[PDB]
Amino acid sequence: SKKVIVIAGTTGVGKSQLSIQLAQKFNGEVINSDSMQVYKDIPIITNKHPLQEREGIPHHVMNHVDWSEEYYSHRFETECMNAIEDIHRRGKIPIVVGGTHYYLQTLFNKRVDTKSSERKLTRKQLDILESTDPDVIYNTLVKCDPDIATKYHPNDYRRVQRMLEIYYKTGKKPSETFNEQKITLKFDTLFLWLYSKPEPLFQRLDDRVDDMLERGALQEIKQLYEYYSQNKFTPEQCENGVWQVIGFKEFLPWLTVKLEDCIERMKTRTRQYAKRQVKWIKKMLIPDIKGDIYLLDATDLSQWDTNASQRAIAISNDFISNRPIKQERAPKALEELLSKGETTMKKLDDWTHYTCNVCRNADGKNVVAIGEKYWKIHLGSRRHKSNLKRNTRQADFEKWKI
Amino acid sequence: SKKVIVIAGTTGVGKSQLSIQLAQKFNGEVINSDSMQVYKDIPIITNKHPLQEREGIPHHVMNHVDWSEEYYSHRFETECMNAIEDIHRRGKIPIVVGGTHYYLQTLFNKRVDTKSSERKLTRKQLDILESTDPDVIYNTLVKCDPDIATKYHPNDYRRVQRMLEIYYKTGKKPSETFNEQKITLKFDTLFLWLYSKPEPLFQRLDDRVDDMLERGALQEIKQLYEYYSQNKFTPEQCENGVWQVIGFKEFLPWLTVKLEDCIERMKTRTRQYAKRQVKWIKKMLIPDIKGDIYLLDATDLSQWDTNASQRAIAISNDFISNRPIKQERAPKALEELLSKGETTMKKLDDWTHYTCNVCRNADGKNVVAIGEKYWKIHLGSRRHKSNLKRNTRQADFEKWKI
RNA sequence: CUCGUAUGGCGCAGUGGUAGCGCAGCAGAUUGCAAAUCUGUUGGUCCUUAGUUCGAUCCUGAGUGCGAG
RNA sequence: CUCGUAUGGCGCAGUGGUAGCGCAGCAGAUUGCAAAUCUGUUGGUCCUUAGUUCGAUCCUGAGUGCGAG
Ligand SMILES: [Mg+2]
Ligand SMILES: [Mg+2]
Ligand SMILES: [Mg+2]
Ligand SMILES: [Mg+2]
Ligand SMILES: [Mg+2]
Ligand SMILES: [Mg+2]
Ligand SMILES: [Mg+2]
Ligand SMILES: [Mg+2]
Ligand SMILES: [Mg+2]
Ligand SMILES: [Mg+2]
Ligand SMILES: [Zn+2]
Ligand SMILES: [Zn+2]
């Protein structure tokens, strides 16, 4: 049936570079899945693949959103889906590339459609959702469908809110909605994971930040600051739209010697991003696709043509030819990356909550752990210990008085 | 979503035995997938799991077909499908068990519906399908849609015929029909493969044949012979319905000291069956389900409870709990069975035909190899060699004639 | 003692010029027969020995094994 | 050869009773913000040393190291 190739991996691994090679070799068009590359201009910091390096290969769902808009999952689901259909009905093979692996969920119905589910929210309902209270909306969720509230921490406002929002608009318990999800892969998809040891990568990711400024990043930064300014925007705005990009918010303090710091801070955010990306691919993506993925070692660039190019072409060739892949699925070196221990084994299965009646956070609320394993990690934490001691001593001082 | 557990494996591995344990533990009902256990009575030779060993667990699509009927794929697809639906709408989890792994294809749309595709075959069309000629129906296929004819040998009458039959009833090239198949798994299925080293198994399969007669197999054999008789049936009938079962046709010659031979011949057929079953599971089933299967070592029965019972329960438990399986998927010992080299690597990919203009079979037709690899195997065969020599020597007597 | 046979794991051909078939075995196939079906392929040097002959697995002699007498 | 100053990976506080803050780091989460966000958490017992006091990072005196005319 209609095939679809997807390329995943961390930043600066050659995803775009590969995507092009395959596109040419197999007659296809690229579809960006990077949540930040969907915005207008600002190519240097948003690291868009230059045109004179696309061999004319068509690109979709990329650079079209106005800095005034707020892109998101569904916006991608509809857009990415159209590109697929369109590319397919033209005898071409789609190729989705990006670092926002979260969006990839659309490729296998891992979402909840609440748009076609019209329902005028009630004054009572809304007043709860948009409540100014800290942990009140959570209690509401625990009340209606506690089997979903237990899968979230009482502080995960963004998510706890979403869940309740669903319960309202759909009038159906979100927990149930999930148990009923089919979660089946859409289209005969081929997941290619381009990977590279963290050390070598981190180095490249750093240098690619240096000559990233040399190419005139500061110009795009000031530009972004001009728009940021003349708009009365506060730093807390850097949690929406383009304002989330890694390459702007980091230099905000340099916009009130020290610019050098904003650069380091940026190099760090990038580093962390790459790390969180692997974690997702290993604990979220792979487990979701039952492990039907193929690794490509791009650690030693001096090679690439062999480890990435050829291998990717080899697998893709058998793939498109509508045949069972004979390739090893993973080179000896990265073999353990697809192991159960490195993947589904790490996923949290115990959701029972625990509230330490002795420890409390800066927000005043008492610490609440999820899962017996971590509940204990906390009990043995110096935090809990140091606090359990001061508590005992205070309680003891009185014992002595008597 | 609606889960479905399936248990595959060779004969005498404990599939039924396991199916029951799971059924109880997880509240489910068994669905037989054995093409021979679907017939009436004849339990000893058809090895039906005894009732007083089913703990009252419901069984479906098993023992209901009259010896006068001819069960087949679709017949199973509809029947198996109903049981699933029915079991599901009752809060129960279906458990399909059997050795006819071929039928399992229904679990992931690996067939072609040609019943709802009514079309009065033409006198010209029919005269070709039911042609008395040896290799004429094949030529017709090569004419219309040669891309499918090349995937079959010109002697595979049963299949070449079906392909052409499809081309007619559907008026759509069968080759195309396949390239368009989605081949997606139906229901959240869990494939459990109960395996056992061939040697220990072969031993059990043999003794299993001895006390199989002691339980009164000959009584069922004579019974089958009574019906076989008084019906003017010839041995060539043993290619249809129950007549295919392993436990009857083998004793036909003993029905015109020598019975001992018919028993050996049976132990062999069973042995071969077990071998062909593994080959299917490794080269057909697994490759088709992308390798989403879990092995259970039942080689050392003294264990079972640990390697089979517990493990199966552990995996099934996480499965039914709608959670990503944390189990290893394969015990160190049988690890290599799920390797690419032992599976998709063996599947034939080269379909180019080759006709040895020198070698010919008993039917007169010239040998035709499929796949360069095997084309060569033939060229170096003693058959081809011995024949190429007599041919040269005879031609060398022509030069001497000048 | 009569007359017979002695070929790859087993059951069988064959020819005065250095051997095939079936079965098992191994392997590929499998989209209404699948416990069925199709297809490809590895094994011996024709029991030992002395001769006849240009040359013997096949012809004669003997030995040995086995077969019904 | 007289003054300063050294506390977890880095950067800096600090009470006489056996230690913090910021970063990193490590871990769990993710079904309309995901380059985001939520959550949990490992590292040192305070340069070494003589003592001063019931007691020591925090007091007194040496020595090590760096910086300072
Ligand atoms: Mg890119
Ligand atoms: Mg703009
Ligand atoms: Mg390169
Ligand atoms: Mg048992
Ligand atoms: Mg059974
Ligand atoms: Mg009957
Ligand atoms: Mg076999
Ligand atoms: Mg013999
Ligand atoms: Mg002579
Ligand atoms: Mg001291
Ligand atoms: Zn605590
Ligand atoms: Zn030949």
XYZ file of C-alpha atoms (C1' of nucleotides) and ligand atoms in Angstrom, chain C residues 52-55, ligand 9:
5
model
C 37.519 -62.859 -20.049
C 38.062 -58.003 -22.743
C 40.858 -52.559 -25.799
C 37.517 -51.565 -21.662
Mg 44.353 -58.666 -21.561
